Amino acid sequence: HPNLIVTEQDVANIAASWESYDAYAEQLNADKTNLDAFMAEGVVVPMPKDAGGGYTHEQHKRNYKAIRNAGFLYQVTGDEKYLTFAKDLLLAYAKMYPSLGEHPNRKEQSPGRLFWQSLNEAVWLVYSIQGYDAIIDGLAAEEKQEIESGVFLPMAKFLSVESPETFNKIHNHGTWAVAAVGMTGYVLGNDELVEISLMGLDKTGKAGFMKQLDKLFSPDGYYTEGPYAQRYALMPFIWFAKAIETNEPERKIFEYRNNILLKAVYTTIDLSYAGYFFPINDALKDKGIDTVELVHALAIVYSITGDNTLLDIAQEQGRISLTGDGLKVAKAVGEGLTQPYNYRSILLGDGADGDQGALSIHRLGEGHNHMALVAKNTSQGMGHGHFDKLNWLLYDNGNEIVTDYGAARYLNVEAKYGGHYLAENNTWAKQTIAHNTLVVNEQSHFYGDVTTADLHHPEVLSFYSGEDYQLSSAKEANAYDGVEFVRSMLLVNVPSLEHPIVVDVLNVSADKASTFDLPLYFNGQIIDFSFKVKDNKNVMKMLGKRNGYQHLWLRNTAPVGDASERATWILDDRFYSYAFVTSTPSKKQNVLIAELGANDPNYNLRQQQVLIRRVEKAKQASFVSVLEPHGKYDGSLETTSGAYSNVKSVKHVSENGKDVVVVDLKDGSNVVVALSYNANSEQVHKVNAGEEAIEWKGFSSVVVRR
Amino acid sequence: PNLIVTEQDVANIAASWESYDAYAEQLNADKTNLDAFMAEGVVVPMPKDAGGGYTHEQHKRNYKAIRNAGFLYQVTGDEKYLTFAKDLLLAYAKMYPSLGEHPNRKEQSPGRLFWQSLNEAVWLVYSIQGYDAIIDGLAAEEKQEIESGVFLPMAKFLSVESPETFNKIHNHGTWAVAAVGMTGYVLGNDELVEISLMGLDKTGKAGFMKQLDKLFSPDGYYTEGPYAQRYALMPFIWFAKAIETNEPERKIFEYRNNILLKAVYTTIDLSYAGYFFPINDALKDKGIDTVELVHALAIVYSITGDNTLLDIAQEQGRISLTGDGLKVAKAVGEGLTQPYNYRSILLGDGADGDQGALSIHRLGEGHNHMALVAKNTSQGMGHGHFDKLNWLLYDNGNEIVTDYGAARYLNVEAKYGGHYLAENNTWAKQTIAHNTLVVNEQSHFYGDVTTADLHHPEVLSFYSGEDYQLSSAKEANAYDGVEFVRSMLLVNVPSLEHPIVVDVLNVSADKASTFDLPLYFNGQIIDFSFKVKDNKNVMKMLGKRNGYQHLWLRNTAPVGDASERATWILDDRFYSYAFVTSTPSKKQNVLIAELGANDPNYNLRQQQVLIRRVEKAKQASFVSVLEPHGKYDGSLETTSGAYSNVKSVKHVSENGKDVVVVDLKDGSNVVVALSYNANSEQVHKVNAGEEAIEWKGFSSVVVRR
C-alpha cells in the first residue's frame, strides 16, 4: 500500500525527485493549492438529492477527487493533514452509505445511491479507492473496519451482485463498474471481487473485463462509438489494467489480444488533429488530447513501452499525469529524449472483428499541422451515431476545412436544457443533410431509423497509402431502398503544387428518379464563385421541410451545367479551392448556398455555411470534386500570393463501370485519376475518354502528365 | 551607413547577432529569402501595371532587396550582396531618367515607377538605405551614375515637381519628405534636407516640422485612428532616425514635448492582445507585429531604456533588424523585461486635442485584461465611420462588443483588386453597423462626410479611479432636431468576479422617432429572458437603406418596463447583457438580426446583432449592464457561474439627471448616479422607488448591503 495506480516504489521516486521538474511540480503544486482551499471548508458529505450539474452531484464529484488527491499528497509530502481529511471524508461516507436506497432523482438510467445514475457511482469508487489505497498503512484497524464494511464492500456489492444488467454489460457502463469493483478487489485483497470483475458474476467469462477487451475494440484498438466516446472508455480500461499489472503481472494484461490496450491508446491519438478529436458522431468539438483519460493513458503507455515519440504528444498535451508513470514522462522530456510523433495513414476496421466497415485516416505532411482526410465508412455506433455513411472531413494548416458538426449540446450549462442533448441533436446534428455525404430525396440514410441503421455497415472496397497518393473506397448499398452509392477519396501528391489535393468521386444509382444533394460544410470566408448566383430578392426561406432541411436557410441558388465549377475561400493564411463536376443524364442541376439557423428559436445552433450540389430527377450521377489548398495571405507583412487556384478545370469520364478524372492544371500539366473497382492488382484496364485512351494496373492509378 | 543604421551599429550587429536566437533566426530567414530572390537575377521591368499587378509587386521586392542586400553586405562582408545591390540600382539609373508618368497615371497624383507617387516615396525610403550601406564598396563612376540616374531625379520629382503632394499636411507628405529628406542626408545635399524639414519655401508653413505639430494631437494620437497611425509611424520615425543620426543638435526626439515618443506609446495604447482597435477603416488582422511598430518600438527603446517596452517586444515576437533592435534583443536576454503598464487614458483628438476624444479604459492584470473603448472622436475624413459615441469591449483576450472595421481583402485580386469594396460604404461606414444610436434608420450626419467633417462630439467627463471609471460625451449634430449623450462606466463590484460595464444613452428629438441601439456581440447565445415571435421560416431584409439592406431579421421579441437579459458564451467565459429603455413610448421591441443580405459576392462576414428598437418616441434612455461571469472548461468538463449575477436593472430620470440601480441576485445592489454637472461640490437629489439618492459631482457609484 499503495499498490494500484501508484506503487510504494513509485511514491519514493516521486518524493525523491518531483521538485526537479518544473511542469510536474507546477501541476502538483496547483493540485495541492486547490485541495488546501477545499480542505479549508471541512468535511462536507450531503445526502444525495440532485442530478446532472446539481449541487450534490457536483459535491460528491469534488469529494472523490479530494479523496484520491489527499491520499496521493499524504504519500508524497509525508504531511499528516492529508491523511486525516481523506480519512474523515471516508468515515462520513461509511456512516451514511448503508442507509441509502436508490437516489431520489433516478431516471430510466440504472439508478445509483450517491448519484442519480450508477455510472457516477462507479467513477466515485474508481477515484476513492485510490485515496484509500494510499491511506491504509496510516490507519487503525477499527477505522479500516468502518470504511470497508461501511462504504466499499456495500458499494462493490451494489455495483456487482445487485446490478447484473449493468455489471454484466458489454458496454462502457460495464467497464466502469468492473474497474471499480475489481480495483476495490485489489486494495482489500478480495479474490471474489477480482474474479467477478474479470470474468463476470458467474465467472464463466461470458461477461466481465476480458470479454470487454475482446468486444469493445476492434483488433486495431478502435472503439465503435468514435473518438469522443473512445477517450472516455480509456480511463476505466487503462486504470483497471494498471491495477491488474501492479498486482498480478502474471496475467500479462498489457499483452492481452496482441496488446489491445496499447493499440487503444495509440488509436486515441491517431483519432486527433492539432490537439482535438475528429468530431464524428456525438462529439463536442473542444474535447482534445489534454483530456484527463488520455493524459493518464499516455504516461502508462510510455511507462510500458519507452516510446519516445509519445513525448511529443505529451508536450502538445501540456498537462501531465501526477503518478509514477507521469514522472517518467517528465524525466524523459527533461533529458531531451523527445522524438517527433509518427502520424500514419491507417484503416481502422470497425466492430469487434474490424469487419463492419472502417474509419480511414489519411495523413500527409510534416509536424502536427499536416493535411488529414477522414473517410467515415463506419457502422452506426448505435444511439450516438450519425446518419452519415461515407461522410468525410478534411484538416489542413492546423484547422478544420471540411467539417463535421458534432453534437448539439453545451456541457453543464443548465440554461441550455440542463446541459443535455438538445432537441436539435436529433433534428439536426444526426441528419445526413448536416454532413458532407449524399442525401437522396431530402431524407436521411436509413430514413433516420437507428434500428434499421444498426443492421448495416458500409463495404470497404480498397485502402491504399503510398508516396504517390492515398485512397479509400467504400460502397453503401442499404441507406435507401433501391439506391446504391460508392465513394472514393484520394489524397494526391502533385509535385508542381505546394500542397496535396483531395480528389473525390461519388457514384450513385437509383431505381426511381430522385433528388441527389451533396453538401460541403466549409470553414472560412468565401472569396469568389465561378457560377452566377440568382438574386435572392432580399429574403431567405427555409430550405426544405424535414430531416434537417428545416434548419437551413437558402441564401442563393445558381445554375450549373457541363463544365466544372469552382468555389474559393480563405481560412487564416491559406486559400482552398473546390472544383466540382457532376456527370448525370439529367439536365436539372443547381448549386445551393445555405446557412444554418432556421427553426432555432432557442439559438442552439451555431452559425455555418454550406455549398450543396443538387441534381433533380436522376437515376444516375457522378459527383466529382477536387479540394486544393493553395496560396499565402499574410495580413501582418501585407503580402498575398498563389491566391488563384492552380486548377483550370476538372473532367470526368466513365466507361464499363470504370472512372477517369482529369484535373487540368493552369501550368499546362494535368493529373489523371483512374478507378476500376476491381481488387486484382494485376488486371489491366482501358478507358476511352473524350479524345484519349487511358490504361493502368489495379483498382486505381494516379499519374501526372506534362 | 549613417541613416537608420550607423557604422557603430553594424559593428555591434556583426559582433553579436549570432548569439541572440530570435534575432539570428529572423536575420537568417531574411538572408535565406534574399538569397532565393537573388538567384532569379536582376529583374528591373519597364513601368507597366498597378497595385497587385506584376511590375508593381516586382519593384516592391526590389526596394526591399536593395535595403536588405545593403544591410547584409555590411553585416556579413560578402561582396555577393554588394554586387546585387549595385546592379539593381545600376539598372534603375539606366532607366529612370527616360521616364514620364507611369502608363497607369490616375487623377490620384501619379508616380513614374508606380501608379501613384506614394509607392515611389516608399521605394526611395528603402532604396536609399541600401545605397547608404553599399557606398564603401563603390567606385566614383558608379556613385555618379547612381545618384544622377535615380536618386536626385526621383528626389526632384517627389518634391519640386510635385508641390501639392510635397507640401501636403498628410501622410502623403510625410512619406515624400521622408524620402527626399533621407536622400538629402545620404547624398550630403543640404537643399533636400531643408526642403523636407521646412517645405519648398523653407518658411516652415509645410514640411516635416508642421506635420509633427499638425498630424498628431498632443497625446500622440493620429486622427484617422490606430490603423492609419501604425502606417504613418514609419516615415515619421524613420526620418526622425535619419535626423537624429546626422544632426543630433536638432533634438528631433525632444520636439513638441517628445511628440514622437508619444506617438509610439499611443500606438501601443491603441491595441489589445496584439491587435489594433478596428475603429474607422481598419483590417482586424493588423496588429503590433506590423513592420512599422517593430522598428518604432526598437528606436524608442534605444532612446528611453524603458524596459516596459520589452514586454511588448516579446508579444510582437518580431524584432527590428537594426542596431536599436539589437539593443532590445540584448535587453531581453538580460532578463530586463518589465510588465507594460496599461493606463486608462483620454486621447484628445485633432492637432490640439480638443475635437472630441477617444477614451480607453483598462482594468486588470496582464495583456488579457478588460478594455472599454469609447469613440467620442471627430470624423477622421473619408476613412471615418458614421459612428459617433460608438463603443467597444474587450475581455479575456477577446473582443466582446465589436467594431466591423473595413470591408476589404488586402491584395486579394479576386476581391475587387484588394480595393475597398462597395460594401465598405454601404455597410462598414453606416451607423447601423455600429454599437451606437440610429435615428429613423439613417446614419449620423445622414452619411455625408463633408457635414461629418464640420463637427465633433463634446466630451463632458472623464474619470478613472480604483472605485470606477467613466467617459461621458454629448453628440448634438448627428441629426436635425436630435441631441444625444452617452456615458460608459466600468464599475468594480468587490463581490463580483469581473468589472461591470454600465451604459446610459439619452436621446431627445423634436419629432417622434425610431431609435435603434445595436450591440454586435461575439459568441454563442445561451438564452434570452424575452420571448421571440416565430419567424415563420423566413428571414427578410431588415430595412431598405443605410446599412439596413445588409441585415436579415431573424427574430423580434417584445419588451417593456422590466429589464431584459441576453446571456452568451465566448471561449471559457459567459457574458450577460441586461437592458432597459425608459421612454414615454409604449412600442419597444428587440430584434435579432444577421449580416448577409444584399451581399451577392459574399464580401461580408457572418455576424449577429441584438438591436433595441423604440418607435414613435421623442425621449429615450437606453440603459445597459454588460457583465462577464463564470467559467466553462471543456477540457476538464466543469462549468461555474453560467448564470448572470444581475437580478435586474432599473433606471429613473429626474430633472435631467439619471439614477441606475442594478440589483444583484445576492440581495445587494449598485447605484450609479449621473448629474451631467461638472462642478464637484454641487449636491444632487433623485427619488427612486421613493427612496432618495443624493450625491456630489458629475457621477457617483455606490455598492450597498
Ligand SMILES: [Zn+2]
Ligand atoms: Zn456528425
Ligand SMILES: [Zn+2]
Ligand atoms: Zn467602424
